[PDB]
Structure 1
Amino acid sequence: ALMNSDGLTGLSNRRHFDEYLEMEWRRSLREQSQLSLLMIDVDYFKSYNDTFGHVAGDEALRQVAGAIREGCSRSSDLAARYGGEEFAMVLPGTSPGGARLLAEKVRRTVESLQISHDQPRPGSHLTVSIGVSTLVPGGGGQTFRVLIEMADQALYQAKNNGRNQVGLME
């Protein structure tokens, strides 16, 4: 077993990520500071594995992890593979605008890989959709997972508005 990382990509694993996110949520709750989150998801990944095989798939995920840690400039940022082709990045102290720009950096860096795909049509390249959320944590029964929920809602927006794009929550 691995304690903090993902075997395939070498990024953080889900458990390590969730724990960090909860600490940062609570930090932001006490500071009343903005906490942003990216949920990043390879487009047409099912088709991709079916057509090119799980080895090709794994190599693609590895390259995407590379794109992702590249966007992971600042020490306080943390990137994980949440599961399958789903990744996550926490961005403490990051405004909606800053979160969105960084997601665009990641999105473009993924396109720069030029990984050939035949979706949405022959001659295409691998892309990611990204949901961005940001919140100043509040009172009552509101856990850190609301931030994930918001990003996942943003992710649906991006996925249903044509993919290869960033969705936004607020």
Structure 2
Amino acid sequence: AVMVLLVDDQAMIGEAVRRSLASEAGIDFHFCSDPQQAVAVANQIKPTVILQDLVMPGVDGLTLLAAYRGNPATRDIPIIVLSTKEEPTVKSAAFAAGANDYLVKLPDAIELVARIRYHSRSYIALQQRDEAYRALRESQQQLLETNLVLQRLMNSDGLTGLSNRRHFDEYLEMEWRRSLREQSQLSLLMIDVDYFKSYNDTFGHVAGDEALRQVAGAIREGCSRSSDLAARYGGEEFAMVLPGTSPGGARLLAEKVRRTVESLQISHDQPRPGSHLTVSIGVSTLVPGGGGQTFRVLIEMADQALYQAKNNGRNQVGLMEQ
């Protein structure tokens, strides 16, 4: 994994290093005698550590240190400056210049390979750390979005974006079971857009669906409690469950849903020439009692209320308690 790039004008020092990194596998070596090519050599072999001689003819090791730190290609490679006359004034200045280590020309072979490996691993760990951090951010972003999408396809109505039929009915069933234990009121609204069939085959589908999308927008705005839930049972049929809600409160939301839906003023000629889209709403409510009683009985009640509503003129609200 290691690749040592040594820079020094002394052809012998370059050898004392080569002959110590020899009996050491996993660590490539490279020797450069001409400082004028050092920067070049560095942008090619891509070392994991650079041993840079401080004093050479024509260029000092610190102006080369500024070169290695000039391009991304090598700006992160750790460098060990090698000195001859150990002058703690230049030493101090080397570190200030960013030098990562300082060695009085060639120490014990055991130490020289220990520093070479420690720096290389550090260099690679930083490389792999950022790389990982980046790939990780992508992965989690991907996974989060993928799950959002699958969730939506799983429990939501495509057009309306509201919950689908089975998601809703399963919630209704679990809410019924909990209202049975807590002996509380469970209200349900069955919402049908009036004369929608008539409307659909006279304005097309894109107009029908566009209207159903709008009505759905007035339906979710009707309930706001975290435990409240609205659905598009299918076609122009919607549903809303309101845990812990009383007949009166349920009635309020129904009426509020009806009113806001009408204030959309979606033109339609069936109720007669100059009217607009409206909805009939059946409202039911109960406190689950023991014995038989399934949530299906609450639904039968809402449907009856819905039927009564339609047969009394539509665009109004029907209630039922038993």
Specify the TM-score bucket, using the shorter chain as the normaliser: over 0.9
Quote the offset at 1:105 in angstroms. Answer: 0.5
Deviations 1:124-151 (A, max 9, x none): 0000000000000112121111111100
- The answer for unaligned runs of 5 or more in structure 1 is none
Moved over 3 A (4+): none
Post-superposition shift, 1:50?
1.3
Distance 1:81 1:156 in 2: 18
Instruction: Tell me the alpha carbon deviations over residues 70-117 of structure 1, each in whole angstroms, 9 at most, x when there is no partner.
Output: 002111110000111000000001000000000000000101110000
Instruction: Return the offset for 1:17.
Output: 0.1
- Secondary structure, in 3 states, of the residue corresponding to 1:3? helix
TM-score (norm 1): 0.98
Which structure has the bigger radius of gyration? 2
Residue by residue over 1:32-86, the C-alpha shift from the partner in whole angstroms, topping out at 9 and shown as x without a partner, is 1000000000000110011111111100000000000100211111000011100
Secondary structure, in 3 states, of the residue corresponding to 1:71?
coil
Give the alignment of 1:10-49 within 5 angstroms: 10-49=161-200
* Equivalence map 1:72-151=2 (5 Å): 72-151=223-302
Looking at structure 1, the residues matched to 263 and 313 of structure 2 have their Cα atoms a distance apart, in angstroms, of 19
TM norm structure 2: 0.52
Identity of counterpart residues, as a percentage?
A: 100
Higher relative contact order (CA 8 A, sep 6+): 1
Where in structure 2 are there 5+ consecutive unaligned residues? 1-152
1:161 to 312, 315, 318: 312
